[PDB]
């Protein structure tokens, strides 16, 4: 019935190619039922010290994809679930990722607030967390 590590396995079979991310994103977008489940799993995975920066950045791309495409699907369930964990994950990666990677996530999170992907309540928390880490 339920495939074990169905989400985890896909995260380890992705590439930095849009054709790859889209293949997993479109697969997740059809199963919005597990929105809160994949959201916490994503969060937990990126919080694991066993996950190298390569995998962290890869998983981050999948999040941007599903939350952005969710606008067309009109499924706020994804944005809601991923939004509450995004503020945490973004705050963590922004304090561990190098200069070259922080810049990449900057444009990723920028488009999220520019396109009003998440609620203003959490959006204001994400942007402030990024600035807080810059307070030394």
């Amino acid at each position: 019935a339920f495939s074990s590590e169905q989400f985890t396995t896909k995260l380890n079979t992705l590439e930095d190619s849009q054709e790859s991310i889209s293949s997993a994103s479109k697969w997740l977008l059809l199963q919005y039922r597990d929105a809160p489940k994949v959201a916490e799993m994503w969060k937990e995975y990126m919080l694991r010290p066993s996950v190298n920066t390569r995998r962290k950045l890869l998983g981050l791309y999948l999040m941007n994809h599903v939350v952005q495409q969710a606008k067309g699907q009109k499924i706020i369930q994804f944005q809601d679930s991923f939004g509450k964990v995004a503020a945490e994950v973004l705050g963590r990666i922004n304090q561990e990722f190098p200069r070259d990677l922080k810049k990449k996530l900057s444009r990723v999170v920028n488009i999220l607030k520019e396109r009003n992907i998440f609620s203003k309540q959490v959006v204001n928390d994400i942007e402030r967390s990024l600035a807080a880490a810059l307070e030394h």
């Binding site: 590439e15 930095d16 849009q18 054709e19 991310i21 952005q68 495409q69 444009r107 990723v108 488009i111």
Partner: peptide, 9 residues
């Protein structure tokens, strides 16, 4: 191939 937010698919 490089992934950018403006080019997801």
């Amino acid at each position: 191939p490089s992934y950018s937010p403006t080019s997801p698919s």
